[PDB]
Write a protein that binds this ligand. Sequence first.
Ligand code: NI
Length: 341
Amino acid sequence: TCPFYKKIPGTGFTVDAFQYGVVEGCTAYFLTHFHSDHYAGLSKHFTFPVYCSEITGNLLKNKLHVQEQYIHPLPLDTECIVNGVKVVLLDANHCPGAVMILFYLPNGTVILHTGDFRADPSMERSLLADQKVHMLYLDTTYCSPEYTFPSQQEVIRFAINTAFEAVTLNPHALVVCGTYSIGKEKVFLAIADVLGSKVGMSQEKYKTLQCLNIPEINSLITTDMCSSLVHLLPMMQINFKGLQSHLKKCGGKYNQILAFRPTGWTHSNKFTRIADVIPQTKGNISIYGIPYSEHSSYLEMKRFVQWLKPQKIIPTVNVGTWKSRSTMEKYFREWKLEAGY
Ligand code: NI
């Protein structure tokens, strides 16, 4: 049964609610982004209207085979009417095609559902600036002050400088980057660009990337592994055994691997700066865990909420334990008392 925090009161709508069967009273199913915990349940046999971004709709059609007649893509930053209710999709600064949804209820209530997001001050100048928001359905993934991480720009600077140094010292080094979902494409695209290479990958991953409207993509990626010195592999193969095995497959073209695992947060964040990050090494294989996040840090989340000043907050992440829920509610009250709303 669908939980309350996935339902939008006063409408026929649900958000990211495809694993509960036919939801009673639901006339339209919204999907914020193409990540499996959110799409879980969709397939070619789904016959209700799905509302989403253009990019999410490309992925539904091509990867899950949802039929076209049930996919309703909406443009961003544009007022649209869905089953008698005004809605707007906004960029969530998460993975490609990820959106936040603004619902303008018939009684005058305005609700923002963030989906998954990485808050940014640029959001303070979107269509959010123009009216009051009463209820916030908030991505609380990292809602505790211990969660600090660097900007995406500092992390990509580190990665580019690390890869360029290694390959210039040893032109026979291969760079490998792990992946298991869409998102974080900048990591592997920025490294391939500094090296003058395409990124090589499986046919299945190439297909997925071709759905993303990324500019000039045919110029940056390939299925010809032999021509590429940056390879993408499944995240589960980014370990010493998996990488040794890959290096064997390359036929003596390479004699060293430098590999990257983009994690979100790891407790090495509470002590060490990005500048100071070191790899795990075994023989001719080094693995770097880099803190590339597509979710808000604690401070970014706090700034957004203190700017928006909602009347009520509904967390959508970390809701399964009483300790988590109590921690989050304490921070929400602090924020409100400090800012004065
Ligand atoms: Ni996500």
